[PDB]
Amino acid sequence: PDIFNRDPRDHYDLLQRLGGGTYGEVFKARDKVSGDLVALKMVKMEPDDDVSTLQKEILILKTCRHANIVAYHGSYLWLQKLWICMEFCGAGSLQDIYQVTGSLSELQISYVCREVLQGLAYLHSQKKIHRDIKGANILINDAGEVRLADFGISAQIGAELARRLEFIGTPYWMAPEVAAVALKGGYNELCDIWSLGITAIELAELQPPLFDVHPLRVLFLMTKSGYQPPRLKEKGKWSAAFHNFIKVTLTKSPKKRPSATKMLSHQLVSQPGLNRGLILDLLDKLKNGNS
C-alpha cells in the first residue's frame, strides 16, 4: 500500500485550513481513532498526472525517519486529490515566528542549529540532501521542538510540476547532463552546512545577508573569486563562539567545509542548557507579547 486508495476524511477530521500556495493546501486535522493532531497537505491532480512517477520519492518518505525531520504518516489518493499526512507543528516556521517576535537570542539560535544539524547529520548519513535550509523550512511545535520541512512533492506533480516543465522547455530535447541538473544534481550535501550558517544570521538579524540587494546581482557577486563570506553585523552582541560558528560553516570551498557531524561538536551547539525551554520562552512571547 504505497498510496492509500481511500478518502483521508474516513480517518481524519479536518479542523482548520492553515495555509495554501504553490506548495498545496495544508490543513490541521485530528485522527478519529487516536485523537492525535496531524497536518494534511493536499495537492490537486491534473488530467495527465501519473502518481506512479512518485514511487521513488514516496519510498524515501517511508524509509527516512528522524526526530528532527517532519514525520511522514502516509499518503492518500481520492477523487483527484493527493493528500500527504504529516506530523503537526502548531507554531509554524521560524520565519513565521521571528516576523512577530523579532530576532532570536544566541541561545535560542544555538538550540535551533543543534537540532537542525541532528536532522542534517541523519539525512546525510542516508545520502540525501535537504537543499533548502532556511527559516521558512524549520518548523516548531507547541512543545518547542524543531523539525525540518521542505517545499514537498507539489514540485513533482500537479500544477506546479506543469509550470516548472514549461519553464525548462520540457525535457524532450534536453541533453542528459542538463536533465541531471534539472533534477538538482551537480553539488553535494555540504551545501546544507553553508545554508545553516546563513539561517543562523537570518534568525539573528531577521533577513539573510544581502537581502536588500537584487537577487541577480547577489548571484553575480557570490560567484566572483574575491567573494567574501558574510558575517554577523553587530560584533559585540554575539559571543566569539557564535562568530566562529558563522566563520566555519560559511567556508567557500566545499572541500574545506565541515560536515554536519563535525559541526555537532562545535562549542556553540555543544554547550549545556540547550533545550526546548528556550523556544517555549519564544512561543510565550509570540502568543502573549514581550512583557
Place this chain on the structure above:
Amino acid sequence: IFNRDPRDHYDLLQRLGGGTYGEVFKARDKVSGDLVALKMVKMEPDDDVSTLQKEILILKTCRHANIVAYHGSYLWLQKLWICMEFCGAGSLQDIYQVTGSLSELQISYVCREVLQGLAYLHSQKKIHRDIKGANILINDAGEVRLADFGISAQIGAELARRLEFIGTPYWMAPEVAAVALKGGYNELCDIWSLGITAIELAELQPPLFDVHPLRVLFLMTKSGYQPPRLKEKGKWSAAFHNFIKVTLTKSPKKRPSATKMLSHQLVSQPGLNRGLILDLLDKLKNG
C-alpha cells in the same frame, strides 16, 4: 537603447504570438516601410536595468547571417521592446504541422545552417539552450535563423520564474549559486538538442514525446540510458543515421563541437541551399 515609445517609430500590424514570457508583433517601419518583429517583455521595478544594458551592447555589436538581426530596443512604461528581423514563414514547427515531415535533404540544410549559427554563438561564449523546431525560424527567402534571447532570460517573468523554481540566492552556497547562474552545463547541449530536432523534423515529434516528461527525465538519468534513434531505418541514408548517433553522444566530453559537426558528410554535401526550403514553402501555400 531608446527611451521612447516604440510606436513613435513603428506601426503595429498584428500580434503574432504571446505568452507568459513575451509577446511578438508584426510591425512596419514608418520612415522606411520595412516589416519587423517586435518582442515586448514586461519589466519590474524589481528588475535590474544595469545587467540588460550590458547584454544589449553585445547584440548591438556582433552579427551573423544565421542569427535573427537586431535592429533596436525601447524601454517605456516598464516594457522592453526588442526590434528584430522579420521571418515571414514562422518556425519549422508552424510549417511541418501543415506540410508533414521534412525530406532528408531539407533537414540536412536546416542542420547545416543551425550549426553555423551555433558555432557563432558558442564562439561568443553563448548557449542557445532551446534548440527545437519551434525556435528555428524561416523567412520567405527560405533562409534559416536562430533567435538570441539571452536578454529576456534575466528580466521580467523569465527571471521571476527562475528565482521561484531554481531558488533565490541568499541561502545558496557559492558552488550551488554557480550552477544556478549558468544552468550548470556547457554549450555541447545545443548539439544534443539539434540531433533531437533532426528526428523531430523527420518524424513530427521528438523521441519519447508520448511518455510522461518526469519519467523521461528519470530514464535519461539511468546509467544504461540508450540515446534515441530514427524510427524507420530504411527511409534514411547512413550519413543521416551517423549524424544522429554522433550528435546524441551521451558524454559531453565526447560530443562533437559545432565546428567539428560542420565537417560531417550530412551537412557537407553539395546541393544544400535555400531552394530546398522554398520547395517546402510552396507545398505549404498550395495543397
